Design an enzyme around this catalytic site. Sequence first.
Site, PDB file in Angstrom:
ATOM      1  N   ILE A 146      32.098  12.147 -90.327  1.00 36.53           N
ATOM      2  CA  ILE A 146      32.597  11.281 -89.212  1.00 36.53           C
ATOM      3  C   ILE A 146      33.578  10.197 -89.709  1.00 36.53           C
ATOM      4  O   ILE A 146      33.853   9.257 -88.934  1.00 36.53           O
ATOM      5  CB  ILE A 146      31.398  10.680 -88.461  1.00 36.53           C
ATOM      6  CG1 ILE A 146      30.536   9.820 -89.387  1.00 36.53           C
ATOM      7  CG2 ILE A 146      30.593  11.776 -87.765  1.00 36.53           C
ATOM      8  CD1 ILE A 146      29.710   8.778 -88.658  1.00 36.53           C
ATOM      9  N   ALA A 177      36.243   9.187 -93.721  1.00 37.59           N
ATOM     10  CA  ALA A 177      36.223   8.851 -95.165  1.00 37.59           C
ATOM     11  C   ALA A 177      36.199   7.320 -95.285  1.00 37.59           C
ATOM     12  O   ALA A 177      37.174   6.677 -94.862  1.00 37.59           O
ATOM     13  CB  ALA A 177      37.401   9.452 -95.900  1.00 37.59           C
ATOM     14  N   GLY A 178      35.101   6.751 -95.791  1.00 35.59           N
ATOM     15  CA  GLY A 178      35.054   5.345 -96.230  1.00 35.59           C
ATOM     16  C   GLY A 178      35.948   5.142 -97.443  1.00 35.59           C
ATOM     17  O   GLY A 178      36.424   6.164 -98.025  1.00 35.59           O
ATOM     18  N   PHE A 207      35.139   4.492-100.268  1.00 38.48           N
ATOM     19  CA  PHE A 207      34.337   4.883-101.463  1.00 38.48           C
ATOM     20  C   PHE A 207      33.853   6.336-101.402  1.00 38.48           C
ATOM     21  O   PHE A 207      33.585   6.917-102.484  1.00 38.48           O
ATOM     22  CB  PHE A 207      33.082   4.016-101.577  1.00 38.48           C
ATOM     23  CG  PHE A 207      33.331   2.584-101.966  1.00 38.48           C
ATOM     24  CD1 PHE A 207      33.514   2.232-103.295  1.00 38.48           C
ATOM     25  CD2 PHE A 207      33.362   1.584-101.002  1.00 38.48           C
ATOM     26  CE1 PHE A 207      33.721   0.907-103.646  1.00 38.48           C
ATOM     27  CE2 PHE A 207      33.563   0.256-101.355  1.00 38.48           C
ATOM     28  CZ  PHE A 207      33.747  -0.078-102.677  1.00 38.48           C
ATOM     29  N   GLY A 208      33.653   6.883-100.201  1.00 44.58           N
ATOM     30  CA  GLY A 208      33.016   8.202-100.042  1.00 44.58           C
ATOM     31  C   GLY A 208      32.827   8.612 -98.593  1.00 44.58           C
ATOM     32  O   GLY A 208      32.562   7.744 -97.748  1.00 44.58           O
ATOM     33  N   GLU A 209      32.924   9.913 -98.325  1.00 44.45           N
ATOM     34  CA  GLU A 209      32.765  10.475 -96.967  1.00 44.45           C
ATOM     35  C   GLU A 209      31.653   9.671 -96.285  1.00 44.45           C
ATOM     36  O   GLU A 209      30.574   9.547 -96.881  1.00 44.45           O
ATOM     37  CB  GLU A 209      32.523  11.987 -97.048  1.00 44.45           C
ATOM     38  CG  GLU A 209      33.792  12.773 -97.370  1.00 44.45           C
ATOM     39  CD  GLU A 209      33.774  14.265 -97.059  1.00 44.45           C
ATOM     40  OE1 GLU A 209      34.845  14.809 -96.705  1.00 44.45           O
ATOM     41  OE2 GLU A 209      32.693  14.890 -97.171  1.00 44.45           O
ATOM     42  N   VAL A 210      31.961   9.058 -95.139  1.00 46.67           N
ATOM     43  CA  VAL A 210      30.953   8.587 -94.150  1.00 46.67           C
ATOM     44  C   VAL A 210      30.550   9.797 -93.319  1.00 46.67           C
ATOM     45  O   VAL A 210      31.458  10.386 -92.716  1.00 46.67           O
ATOM     46  CB  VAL A 210      31.508   7.466 -93.259  1.00 46.67           C
ATOM     47  CG1 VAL A 210      30.522   7.075 -92.176  1.00 46.67           C
ATOM     48  CG2 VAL A 210      31.886   6.253 -94.086  1.00 46.67           C
ATOM     49  N   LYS A 251      27.208   5.983 -95.211  1.00 47.07           N
ATOM     50  CA  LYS A 251      28.233   5.716 -96.246  1.00 47.07           C
ATOM     51  C   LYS A 251      27.693   6.309 -97.544  1.00 47.07           C
ATOM     52  O   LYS A 251      26.585   5.918 -97.928  1.00 47.07           O
ATOM     53  CB  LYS A 251      28.513   4.215 -96.406  1.00 47.07           C
ATOM     54  CG  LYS A 251      28.862   3.467 -95.122  1.00 47.07           C
ATOM     55  CD  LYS A 251      29.754   2.252 -95.330  1.00 47.07           C
ATOM     56  CE  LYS A 251      31.201   2.615 -95.624  1.00 47.07           C
ATOM     57  NZ  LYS A 251      31.811   1.743 -96.666  1.00 47.07           N
ATOM     58  N   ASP A 292      37.836 -10.161 -92.219  1.00 49.61           N
ATOM     59  CA  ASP A 292      38.601  -8.964 -91.797  1.00 49.61           C
ATOM     60  C   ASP A 292      38.138  -8.572 -90.391  1.00 49.61           C
ATOM     61  O   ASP A 292      37.759  -7.407 -90.195  1.00 49.61           O
ATOM     62  CB  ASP A 292      38.435  -7.862 -92.851  1.00 49.61           C
ATOM     63  CG  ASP A 292      39.456  -6.723 -92.792  1.00 49.61           C
ATOM     64  OD1 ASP A 292      40.631  -7.006 -92.491  1.00 49.61           O
ATOM     65  OD2 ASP A 292      39.075  -5.544 -93.049  1.00 49.61           O
ATOM     66  N   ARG A 341      39.013  -2.267 -85.198  1.00 49.69           N
ATOM     67  CA  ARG A 341      38.698  -1.059 -85.993  1.00 49.69           C
ATOM     68  C   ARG A 341      37.397  -1.305 -86.753  1.00 49.69           C
ATOM     69  O   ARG A 341      36.792  -0.317 -87.190  1.00 49.69           O
ATOM     70  CB  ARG A 341      39.840  -0.730 -86.947  1.00 49.69           C
ATOM     71  CG  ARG A 341      39.928  -1.694 -88.118  1.00 49.69           C
ATOM     72  CD  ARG A 341      41.240  -1.545 -88.849  1.00 49.69           C
ATOM     73  NE  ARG A 341      41.220  -2.499 -89.935  1.00 49.69           N
ATOM     74  CZ  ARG A 341      41.853  -3.672 -89.966  1.00 49.69           C
ATOM     75  NH1 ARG A 341      42.625  -4.076 -88.968  1.00 49.69           N
ATOM     76  NH2 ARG A 341      41.697  -4.446 -91.029  1.00 49.69           N
ATOM     77  N   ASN A 342      36.988  -2.565 -86.891  1.00 49.70           N
ATOM     78  CA  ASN A 342      35.785  -2.963 -87.663  1.00 49.70           C
ATOM     79  C   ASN A 342      34.660  -3.376 -86.713  1.00 49.70           C
ATOM     80  O   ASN A 342      33.592  -3.818 -87.218  1.00 49.70           O
ATOM     81  CB  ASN A 342      36.117  -4.094 -88.632  1.00 49.70           C
ATOM     82  CG  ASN A 342      36.958  -3.623 -89.800  1.00 49.70           C
ATOM     83  OD1 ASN A 342      36.873  -2.464 -90.193  1.00 49.70           O
ATOM     84  ND2 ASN A 342      37.765  -4.510 -90.364  1.00 49.70           N
ATOM     85  N   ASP A 390      31.884  -3.614 -91.085  1.00 48.24           N
ATOM     86  CA  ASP A 390      32.701  -3.795 -92.318  1.00 48.24           C
ATOM     87  C   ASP A 390      32.359  -5.122 -92.993  1.00 48.24           C
ATOM     88  O   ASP A 390      32.887  -6.159 -92.548  1.00 48.24           O
ATOM     89  CB  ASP A 390      34.201  -3.724 -92.054  1.00 48.24           C
ATOM     90  CG  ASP A 390      35.026  -4.241 -93.228  1.00 48.24           C
ATOM     91  OD1 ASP A 390      34.996  -3.581 -94.323  1.00 48.24           O
ATOM     92  OD2 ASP A 390      35.684  -5.314 -93.048  1.00 48.24           O
TER      93      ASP A 390
END
Length: 277
Positions: A33, A35-36, A38-41, A59, A152, A156-157, A170
């Site tokens: 759902i 890409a974060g 750091f790694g695929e969310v 995450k 931030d 989007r967050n 976020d």
Amino acid sequence: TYIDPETYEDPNRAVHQFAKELDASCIKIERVIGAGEFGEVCSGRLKLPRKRDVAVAIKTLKVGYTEKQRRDFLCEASIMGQFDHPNVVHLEGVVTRGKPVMIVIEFMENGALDAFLRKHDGQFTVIQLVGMLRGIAAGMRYLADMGYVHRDLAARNILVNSNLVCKVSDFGLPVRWTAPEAIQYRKFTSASDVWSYGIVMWEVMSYGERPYWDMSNQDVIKAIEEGYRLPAPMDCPAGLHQLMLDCWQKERAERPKFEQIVGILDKMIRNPNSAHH
């Protein structure tokens, strides 16, 4: 009651202090759902001692990480885990050592607010929209008086669930969201967040339109220094645009406070048509 984890001699004592470690066995990954950083969310479910199963988002930290990226990554979980409030995403727990490294957050079925609005363009009434902003305000009044500054804050967050409840997200680490004093002198405060909130307010009513469209950052700042401010998106009541302008006051004192905001937005859902004053 908000401690910074980067005020820590070990950053991975903060993690375990505020985050519940979970057994991977009890975690199901179902889909991707996003890409974060750091790694695929991924989306899935977590099994608690008999409570149907929680829908969760996951995450991941991809492997071959610097012991650092792991610290950075989890400095999100160390922060998010210290907050309990309806309009701030709930942490379920972490997977630190032992198994694939994960932050298990509550599932917002609707995803980020900027994307969810671009997709549902014009589908929402002005009470409903005021209601969504009302939540984020509630979110930030909490964070604010917890002693936390988001830095931030943007549509989007913010994340949206089945029930159109917006929650602040976020928590890790964006010129056109940031206040003048913060851009220029790094004076990040719950006043600079209110400026960003104002921009969120426009993002919402615009239905996920990019702040300042395709104005460069360069242009946006000069614009602001000249006293330029964004206009009432289509159908946005005037009083509600006005709040946007207060949030965008140059003197950071002069902006309203998150408690003042929640207050105003409530009236408007109470008596809608007054939102043109």
